[model samples]
Target: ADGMKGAKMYEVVRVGELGLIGEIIRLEGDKAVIQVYEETAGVRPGEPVVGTGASLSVELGPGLLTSIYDGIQRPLEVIREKTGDFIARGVTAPALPRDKKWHFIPKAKVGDKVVGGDIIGEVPETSIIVHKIMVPPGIEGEIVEIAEEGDYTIEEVIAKVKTPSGEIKELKMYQRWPVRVKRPYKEKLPPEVPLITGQRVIDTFFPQAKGGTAAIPGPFASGKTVTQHQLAKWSDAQVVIYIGCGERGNEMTDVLEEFPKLKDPKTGKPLMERTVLIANTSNMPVAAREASIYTGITIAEYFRDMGYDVALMADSTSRWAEALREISGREGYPAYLASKLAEFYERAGRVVTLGSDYRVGSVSVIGAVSPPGGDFSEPVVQNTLRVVKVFWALDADLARRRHFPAINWLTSYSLYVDAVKDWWHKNIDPEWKAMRDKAMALLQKESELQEIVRIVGPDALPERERAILLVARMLREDYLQQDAFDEVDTYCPPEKQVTMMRVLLNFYDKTMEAINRGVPLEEIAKLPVREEIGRMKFERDVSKIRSLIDKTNEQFEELFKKYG
Candidate 1:
């Protein structure tokens, strides 16, 4: 990179008539090897590449949500408005709206001491989000003048501060942050709260903490996309960044069609009000697909700086790995690939923010890995497992059996379970700690019993072992199975989740009593109470669970009295 610029770290370069965005990697004999972010076909050799003398950064502002962007943060709708829908070469558009006015309210007064990341004022960006105007990271001083509460465009000067060295600085509603650099925070804290996604298997079994990292690996025909959609819709996150990285175009189109009509559980407003989407499909430029993941997380971290819990989903990162394989042929696997993957995952955490007010925030990251032919030994899957703390291994065999989500409890695990136990115990019930352990132990026991059953059938196990497997089946079929299409079953509240699991475990306890009371295991399992325990999942009123539990106990009472 023979850039004439005085010192360059991550300066931008323009490629051709398309204004293809690129960054300088290194200097090699007065030439730069650039990774172009747009389609580079029919371009001749020795094309003019001009350096912008600035790093590749994303503009952070109020008009971010309810907007669609490409890999480079260019607004897709604005580009279509300027040029035709096809996005012709050399078309340009701003990432945020320049003409729209926002209602700004001042928070800090003149002559007040301020620092970097200090909230100077606020703007109601949407019905659901209060956009905080923060002092830029490198500037701190005494406030000189604060703009009064009024409607102003993003470009207008909203606040002013005089530095200790006697220099005045004007602040606006927007600023820029470099996408490749991880934003600074006070310190990373141990994850304490679960990012509850109303899914039974994830929240109940392999729970992921707020600001934790999780990987979903599966093959073709598995429900990876569907599972990610469920999490995006129902997870308790203040902001959602969904990156369609190298996925099918139709997959993103489905999200665009469905997301706007959905409602947020808390705000009772449109779900799109707190969502930002980045689309870089398989047909898009390969280099842009590689950059979209970074772009999405950088936006996620921006919200975390505001002390909000943000969740980011990267669907099918395997295609990004494929892009790397193409650029670095077969032999470049260990050269730069491993290090880049590590750099991406290290951005996720729960932290105490460095803002003027000490606030806590988190960025939970969930990435889907599409291993070729369902093999976990692949380099991409192996490397991702090393980085993430939680793994939801999707099973194609379960999907073939018509089980939705297809997450295999035997294979999936969560390192955040122990950290989040106190949270559940305090918020849901005091019995949560012991109940979660007992539930998982039963599943682990069932896995062992299956090995013996395959050789000698169910008759080989004793009465207690047989009852344990029977109750484990009830746990799987009734408690773990969730219907995404049903209006009531799609999202299960934490309180109701406690009730559902307690009902199942209650049945297991009653069955054990019958087995120990001289009543045969088969006779207890053949009672009318067995089917009623399975039907309690679809019950809407959680209070009704107590009645169901009472009925189950009554049937066992009659059985033991008649046969004792």
Candidate 2:
């Protein structure tokens, strides 16, 4: 027998932090190269390869819908099979269906046992069916609904699937995007659904419309990768695919380990099964990095064609484009500012990883930008922002402030906010608008207070101003900052996030009144509410602070619920 690589043809084998370690071809020796998945500083040739005898796969099984995955496809070691549960690693998802659901339910029943692809369901035999929509995946937990209601979509969970043998399996209501092959002549697809990440400021302030593409740019340790990880964990996507394009190995390892435990907002379980990993870490051979993005998108297209809410996150597209620049630099292409060519601008356009115009598929993309010195003015940053819909510019300074989330909101903008013009202006509650306006005033007041703090050194400011700034500081420290331990990070489900943020904002108004009534700072601060206010900095403790916020927001709830 001849020595053959374990990877199949075109399979991207993730070895350590390096990705696409090598490609397999039938005719010739599949050249092993590095598109370092982590950092590639000292790696050289002649490093022997390692293998687990499997291609890149995502996790599947019970708790799939309730789990979260990092950039690398980590198996939620807690998978439920018939009688035993091995931690399920990632599994490749099958393609999606097309056309309006004409009363088609799953082919299987609640007590039925299914191996992968056992025809769990099918589209109904109906002349009533139309060609415009994508059909839902007939496979999932045990059949829960026989006759689908509302929108019968390809992405919607047509069946309630169970983990082979897991206990108390929280079901997945999968809403998938359609899949398609990328062709040069094909007209570009448009994105729908505002891919809502649970970050209140982001969803409420700088909203990313579904199918909208955004970038998080920072220097080496400025949290670019972490931002991507958080977004992947929190963004409300049905079928999530992550491409660790030039990301770190340890980071990928963390992803592999942490994904399974990421609690799903829906089922109150892990957030792993609904995700896919396309690991092409940083330490890989440089040449291979060029193909990773296209490879990732092509798979995304395949899934999007199925009509799922797909999110594609490229940990660092900057390095992917750099792969091209490195090639051009070697080939003596016309140079722009650096050895990079101006043509590099064309590589990172809007990547519609999911959603179709004629069909209601949604693909959301969040890419990372690594500026050399935290400067967004770099060619890569400027060129990328030009075409992207949302821009979440991160701040190294804020990160240094231990802002954990260094998102620079003042500079960031979600262009698709305009796209949602009609729906938001009319549909949002009037009280919602009032709270938003008040939050704005709070920010401005905070800014003004910051200046006062700087000028008077906190000792000379009036009581009201000082108290106001303290409350503002507490707001930032508590609500704005999320607990590292909290189940929610970047991705907060709509229901839970909307529930929590609105409640907290109400608390800000109600309680701020008590503090603003010429009340002594210490007295108000000493009240029981102060402790809860202190921890609102992190996204956790919502349950702990739930009552306080609820009590405060109860007064305003009816006003907004009229709008809600």
Candidate 3:
């Protein structure tokens, strides 16, 4: 008779022990009810009770400052509404880019002193930004008005940047995509840009991040898994999403056994939930394979609408493709693997997501394709690459290298560099692009260096060639390589990552200059160099490997990349 409908009229649900991290249930006349999170199987109906109001929010303010939240990355929780202020904290189980979070500070509200590193709000923890946020003086002249759907432009009245007008309009990156909008003409395209890896050879030769779909495809022993682990862990992703698709149940069992115990280097918590596992393993019904990728992307889409930076990864999309093949084969769609439709692309195709504005989110998807027989020409792999932003082709040959990366720098293609580079130009320095181009050139020549080392012993090469090659090897060792276990040894934290890159870049430039000057290899090798430079280790002599290179290469990335 009151607000209650179901049986005894009371309704309640369970929540996670750790803050607002679980679900809530609603009752329908006491007989049954609906759950806001995962359902409870052991519950008795008599215990159910009801609470007033809703269990949702913008998650803004300082309490959320400097904290990290984990989940499956579903974006459904992201809502667009201007509140006090905040940043995107990815959705749980339903992973998202990052959206707004509660910052425990004076805030970006007008009339407050603001700095980039100052608290934007608690999105887990003001996100511990390597960068800073811009805060205004007080709400007396605070920002307002929506610039982009997910983005905001100074609408009402805001103090200007020392302008004579006393007020100026400001815009924010957040925005939402238009619902069912059609365009008569194309939008402005971004430039051919690339993010500098800051590694000598990668920037000099093979830059991948600014755009494109790159796959590090390899066989069982090829360290393909290790290679993907390294990229997901080490790559400069603001948000990471790793999908464990079609893995063997045993392999996944090993991961589940160990991953949760490891803490995230970023936020010091279990890494398992940092990632979302879409398990359509070798043991599950094949019918589910085709649906898994969509499930993952649908989650990504939900988060994108919230205005955050997100990355979505599939360990092996091929299984989904295989499922598609099976379905098409059974349905008689004109198969490729069996009786699958040559056009089965309908089921497996992924949506290419961009931002409606700055506050909204943009998603970069990286998927692994475990093609049978290690074939890149497989129709599925080829089709996927054509539609994606970057393509990183993992060399089966890399498995033979002591090089754990297994990513064949030369063959991997990233057509999206134009856009990525454009973004970098707007967001960071442009000179890094020039350095990246140079790095790639040197990377391409590594084969010749390998040939030289093969023909003549290491001591036989000229000093310059030897020095350059040595640095390159060290870069591969430090940044690209990774160890699966021994968690403490392998992962590189963002600060350490910046340090590792900066130091190596510096040393590489120093060595390269010496080499280009025609310094003798024997003389350069004999020089003793040892001194601590931040977290980086020193060399007793130039010949031995650096400690940061070995230590970082061994353990951490696996944990960082292992999203539950």
The prediction achieving the highest lDDT against the true structure is: 1
| Winner by lDDT between candidate 2 and candidate 1 | 1
lDDT of model 1 at residue 513?
A: 88
Worst 10 residues of 3 by lDDT: 177-186
Give the runs in model 1 whose Cα sits over 4 Å from its true position.
1-49, 77-91, 324-332, 372-374
C-alpha lDDT of all candidate models, in order:
0.76, 0.48, 0.40
Per-residue CA lDDT of model 3 for 419-488, tens digit only, reads 4555545554454455455555566566688987788767766666767776666556655554444344
Judge candidate 3 at residue 417 and give its lDDT.
47
Q: State TM-scores per candidate.
A: 0.87, 0.56, 0.50
For candidate 1, what is the lDDT?
Answer: 0.76
In terms of TM-score, the best-performing candidate is: 1
User: Model 1, residue 554: what's the lDDT?
Assistant: 89
| Model 1, span 1-564: residue lDDT tens | 222211122223443211225435322111133444323231234434443434557889899999878676876532233211233111136888999999999889988999888888888888998888889887889998889989999899988889999999989999988777788888999889999998988998899999999988867778877787789878989899987633553455455556688888667899889989887655455545556777888999888888899999877555465532232113355545566677888899999887778898889999887755445564665454466999988888999987777999888999988899898888888888688788989999998889879877976678999899899999989888788777778888888888888878888888888888888987887888688767766777888865777888888889888987
Q: What is the number of residue pairs that collide in model 2?
A: 85
Residue pairs in clash, model 1: 1-31
- Model 3 residue runs over 4 Å out of place are 1-212, 230-242, 272-274, 323-358, 372-374, 395-397, 422-430, 449-519, 530-564
Return model 3's CA RMSD, one decimal.
16.1
Reference-based TM-score, model 2? 0.56
Which of candidates 2 and 3 is the stronger one according to TM-score?
Answer: 2
Candidate 1 at 430: error in angstroms? 2.3
